[PDB]
Amino acid sequence: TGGVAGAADITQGLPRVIELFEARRPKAKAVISEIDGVVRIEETEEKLSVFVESEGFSKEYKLPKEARLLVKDGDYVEAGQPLTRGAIDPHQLLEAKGPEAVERYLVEEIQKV
Ligand SMILES: [Mg+2]
Ligand SMILES: [Mg+2]
Ligand SMILES: [Mg+2]
Ligand SMILES: [Mg+2]
Ligand SMILES: [Mg+2]
Ligand SMILES: [Mg+2]
Ligand SMILES: [Mg+2]
Ligand SMILES: [Mg+2]
Ligand SMILES: [Mg+2]
């Protein structure tokens, strides 16, 4: 779905149902949180950046210009939670929140349509 132009973010109709049954890398993906911790954001001109961290560790996340961020400087983000806005890659959610997560995401993301 969609077409390469400026910022076309999601995928509707059957096109999507295809992108869902067939595990695929959405056009406008959403970087998930491999780590369940707290949020931190930065200012510099070119690229934004969201950092998740626990008393254990922190992870750097590259969020280029188009990425509209759902999360804010401050609260917790469970593993595989949406840190970018839009679509998620099942494989990633598989690795992050688990199978049960992907499974549960697939079903519900499909019925959405
Ligand atoms: Mg545009
Ligand atoms: Mg759209
Ligand atoms: Mg549309
Ligand atoms: Mg403490
Ligand atoms: Mg990176
Ligand atoms: Mg808020
Ligand atoms: Mg609050
Ligand atoms: Mg488990
Ligand atoms: Mg749900």
PDB file of C-alpha atoms and ligand atoms in Angstrom:
ATOM      1  CA  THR A   1       0.000   0.000   0.000  1.00  0.00           C
ATOM      2  CA  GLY A   2       0.545   3.674  -0.462  1.00  0.00           C
ATOM      3  CA  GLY A   3       2.985   5.316  -2.770  1.00  0.00           C
ATOM      4  CA  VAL A   4       6.406   6.819  -2.246  1.00  0.00           C
ATOM      5  CA  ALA A   5       5.551  10.516  -1.803  1.00  0.00           C
ATOM      6  CA  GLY A   6       6.267  12.927   1.060  1.00  0.00           C
ATOM      7  CA  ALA A   7       4.692  11.138   4.014  1.00  0.00           C
ATOM      8  CA  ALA A   8       2.034   8.438   3.296  1.00  0.00           C
ATOM      9  CA  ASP A   9       1.939   6.579   6.657  1.00  0.00           C
ATOM     10  CA  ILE A  10      -0.523   3.585   6.790  1.00  0.00           C
ATOM     11  CA  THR A  11      -2.086   0.905   4.568  1.00  0.00           C
ATOM     12  CA  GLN A  12      -5.871   0.390   4.138  1.00  0.00           C
ATOM     13  CA  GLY A  13      -8.168  -2.230   2.726  1.00  0.00           C
ATOM     14  CA  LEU A  14      -7.200  -5.574   1.310  1.00  0.00           C
ATOM     15  CA  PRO A  15      -3.629  -4.354   0.580  1.00  0.00           C
ATOM     16  CA  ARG A  16      -3.139  -4.389   4.312  1.00  0.00           C
ATOM     17  CA  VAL A  17      -4.777  -7.761   4.839  1.00  0.00           C
ATOM     18  CA  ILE A  18      -2.129  -8.984   2.484  1.00  0.00           C
ATOM     19  CA  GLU A  19       0.660  -7.256   4.441  1.00  0.00           C
ATOM     20  CA  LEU A  20      -0.726  -8.909   7.534  1.00  0.00           C
ATOM     21  CA  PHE A  21      -1.206 -12.521   6.559  1.00  0.00           C
ATOM     22  CA  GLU A  22       2.035 -12.348   4.769  1.00  0.00           C
ATOM     23  CA  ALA A  23       4.437 -11.066   7.403  1.00  0.00           C
ATOM     24  CA  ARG A  24       5.789  -7.936   5.813  1.00  0.00           C
ATOM     25  CA  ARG A  25       7.797  -4.803   6.420  1.00  0.00           C
ATOM     26  CA  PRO A  26       5.137  -2.037   6.347  1.00  0.00           C
ATOM     27  CA  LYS A  27       5.738   0.984   4.219  1.00  0.00           C
ATOM     28  CA  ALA A  28       5.786   3.314   7.234  1.00  0.00           C
ATOM     29  CA  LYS A  29       7.064   1.002   9.955  1.00  0.00           C
ATOM     30  CA  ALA A  30       7.152   1.914  13.632  1.00  0.00           C
ATOM     31  CA  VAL A  31      10.263   1.239  15.664  1.00  0.00           C
ATOM     32  CA  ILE A  32       9.197  -0.930  18.571  1.00  0.00           C
ATOM     33  CA  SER A  33      10.745  -0.939  21.993  1.00  0.00           C
ATOM     34  CA  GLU A  34      13.002  -3.978  22.414  1.00  0.00           C
ATOM     35  CA  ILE A  35      13.424  -2.818  25.998  1.00  0.00           C
ATOM     36  CA  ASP A  36      10.800  -2.173  28.635  1.00  0.00           C
ATOM     37  CA  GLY A  37      11.954   0.946  30.448  1.00  0.00           C
ATOM     38  CA  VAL A  38      11.580   4.740  30.589  1.00  0.00           C
ATOM     39  CA  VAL A  39      11.601   7.450  27.872  1.00  0.00           C
ATOM     40  CA  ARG A  40      14.098  10.194  26.912  1.00  0.00           C
ATOM     41  CA  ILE A  41      14.055  12.514  23.781  1.00  0.00           C
ATOM     42  CA  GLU A  42      16.574  14.942  22.082  1.00  0.00           C
ATOM     43  CA  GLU A  43      16.637  18.377  20.223  1.00  0.00           C
ATOM     44  CA  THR A  44      19.447  18.542  17.534  1.00  0.00           C
ATOM     45  CA  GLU A  45      18.493  19.706  14.016  1.00  0.00           C
ATOM     46  CA  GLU A  46      18.631  16.648  11.733  1.00  0.00           C
ATOM     47  CA  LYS A  47      17.534  13.479  13.535  1.00  0.00           C
ATOM     48  CA  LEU A  48      15.380  12.988  16.604  1.00  0.00           C
ATOM     49  CA  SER A  49      16.006  10.137  19.041  1.00  0.00           C
ATOM     50  CA  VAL A  50      14.125   8.229  21.707  1.00  0.00           C
ATOM     51  CA  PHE A  51      15.960   6.380  24.427  1.00  0.00           C
ATOM     52  CA  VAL A  52      14.459   3.678  26.558  1.00  0.00           C
ATOM     53  CA  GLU A  53      16.266   2.817  29.762  1.00  0.00           C
ATOM     54  CA  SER A  54      15.979   0.857  32.960  1.00  0.00           C
ATOM     55  CA  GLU A  55      18.269   0.865  36.011  1.00  0.00           C
ATOM     56  CA  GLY A  56      19.982  -1.769  33.894  1.00  0.00           C
ATOM     57  CA  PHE A  57      20.468  -0.246  30.468  1.00  0.00           C
ATOM     58  CA  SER A  58      19.367   2.180  27.799  1.00  0.00           C
ATOM     59  CA  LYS A  59      18.872   1.811  24.050  1.00  0.00           C
ATOM     60  CA  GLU A  60      19.240   4.435  21.350  1.00  0.00           C
ATOM     61  CA  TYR A  61      16.492   4.675  18.747  1.00  0.00           C
ATOM     62  CA  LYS A  62      16.916   6.574  15.465  1.00  0.00           C
ATOM     63  CA  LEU A  63      13.644   8.340  14.528  1.00  0.00           C
ATOM     64  CA  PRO A  64      14.184  10.360  11.287  1.00  0.00           C
ATOM     65  CA  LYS A  65      12.200  13.521  10.389  1.00  0.00           C
ATOM     66  CA  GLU A  66       8.909  11.956   9.194  1.00  0.00           C
ATOM     67  CA  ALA A  67       8.458   9.751  12.282  1.00  0.00           C
ATOM     68  CA  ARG A  68       5.709  11.253  14.384  1.00  0.00           C
ATOM     69  CA  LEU A  69       6.413  10.095  17.970  1.00  0.00           C
ATOM     70  CA  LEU A  70       3.627   8.659  20.080  1.00  0.00           C
ATOM     71  CA  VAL A  71       5.685   8.504  23.232  1.00  0.00           C
ATOM     72  CA  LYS A  72       6.725  11.378  25.507  1.00  0.00           C
ATOM     73  CA  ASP A  73       9.726  12.214  27.684  1.00  0.00           C
ATOM     74  CA  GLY A  74       8.824  10.456  30.852  1.00  0.00           C
ATOM     75  CA  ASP A  75       6.790   7.229  30.939  1.00  0.00           C
ATOM     76  CA  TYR A  76       7.376   3.492  30.608  1.00  0.00           C
ATOM     77  CA  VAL A  77       7.278   1.563  27.308  1.00  0.00           C
ATOM     78  CA  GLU A  78       6.648  -2.234  27.473  1.00  0.00           C
ATOM     79  CA  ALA A  79       8.677  -4.426  25.115  1.00  0.00           C
ATOM     80  CA  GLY A  80       7.404  -4.177  21.543  1.00  0.00           C
ATOM     81  CA  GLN A  81       5.350  -1.113  22.324  1.00  0.00           C
ATOM     82  CA  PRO A  82       4.789   1.443  19.543  1.00  0.00           C
ATOM     83  CA  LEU A  83       7.506   4.074  19.721  1.00  0.00           C
ATOM     84  CA  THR A  84       6.827   5.355  16.209  1.00  0.00           C
ATOM     85  CA  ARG A  85       3.354   5.938  14.805  1.00  0.00           C
ATOM     86  CA  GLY A  86       1.719   3.500  12.469  1.00  0.00           C
ATOM     87  CA  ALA A  87       2.534  -0.042  11.318  1.00  0.00           C
ATOM     88  CA  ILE A  88       4.576  -2.723  13.046  1.00  0.00           C
ATOM     89  CA  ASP A  89       6.634  -5.634  11.627  1.00  0.00           C
ATOM     90  CA  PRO A  90       5.344  -8.975  13.088  1.00  0.00           C
ATOM     91  CA  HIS A  91       8.842 -10.435  13.140  1.00  0.00           C
ATOM     92  CA  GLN A  92      10.039  -7.538  15.307  1.00  0.00           C
ATOM     93  CA  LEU A  93       7.067  -7.768  17.597  1.00  0.00           C
ATOM     94  CA  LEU A  94       7.757 -11.504  17.703  1.00  0.00           C
ATOM     95  CA  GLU A  95      11.271 -11.027  18.928  1.00  0.00           C
ATOM     96  CA  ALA A  96      10.329  -8.169  21.311  1.00  0.00           C
ATOM     97  CA  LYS A  97       7.050  -8.839  23.088  1.00  0.00           C
ATOM     98  CA  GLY A  98       6.963 -12.504  22.053  1.00  0.00           C
ATOM     99  CA  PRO A  99       4.821 -14.843  19.896  1.00  0.00           C
ATOM    100  CA  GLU A 100       1.714 -14.362  21.903  1.00  0.00           C
ATOM    101  CA  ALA A 101       2.185 -10.703  21.174  1.00  0.00           C
ATOM    102  CA  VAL A 102       2.605 -11.060  17.427  1.00  0.00           C
ATOM    103  CA  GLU A 103      -0.219 -13.601  17.330  1.00  0.00           C
ATOM    104  CA  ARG A 104      -2.534 -11.275  19.287  1.00  0.00           C
ATOM    105  CA  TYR A 105      -1.392  -8.325  17.180  1.00  0.00           C
ATOM    106  CA  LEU A 106      -1.953 -10.059  13.858  1.00  0.00           C
ATOM    107  CA  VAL A 107      -5.505 -11.154  14.664  1.00  0.00           C
ATOM    108  CA  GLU A 108      -6.582  -7.784  15.984  1.00  0.00           C
ATOM    109  CA  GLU A 109      -4.738  -5.813  13.302  1.00  0.00           C
ATOM    110  CA  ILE A 110      -6.546  -7.867  10.684  1.00  0.00           C
ATOM    111  CA  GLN A 111     -10.015  -7.389  12.133  1.00  0.00           C
ATOM    112  CA  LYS A 112      -9.293  -3.690  12.198  1.00  0.00           C
ATOM    113  CA  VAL A 113      -9.764  -3.700   8.451  1.00  0.00           C
TER     114      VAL A 113
HETATM  115 MG    MG B   1       3.951  15.071   1.594  1.00  0.00          MG
HETATM  116 MG    MG B   2      -2.017   7.342   5.700  1.00  0.00          MG
HETATM  117 MG    MG B   3      -6.315   5.542   3.130  1.00  0.00          MG
HETATM  118 MG    MG B   4      14.612   2.371  41.969  1.00  0.00          MG
HETATM  119 MG    MG B   5      20.101   1.923  15.244  1.00  0.00          MG
HETATM  120 MG    MG B   6       1.647  12.648  27.034  1.00  0.00          MG
HETATM  121 MG    MG B   7       0.605  10.305  32.485  1.00  0.00          MG
HETATM  122 MG    MG B   8       6.423 -14.693  28.213  1.00  0.00          MG
HETATM  123 MG    MG B   9      -4.521  -5.082  21.896  1.00  0.00          MG
END
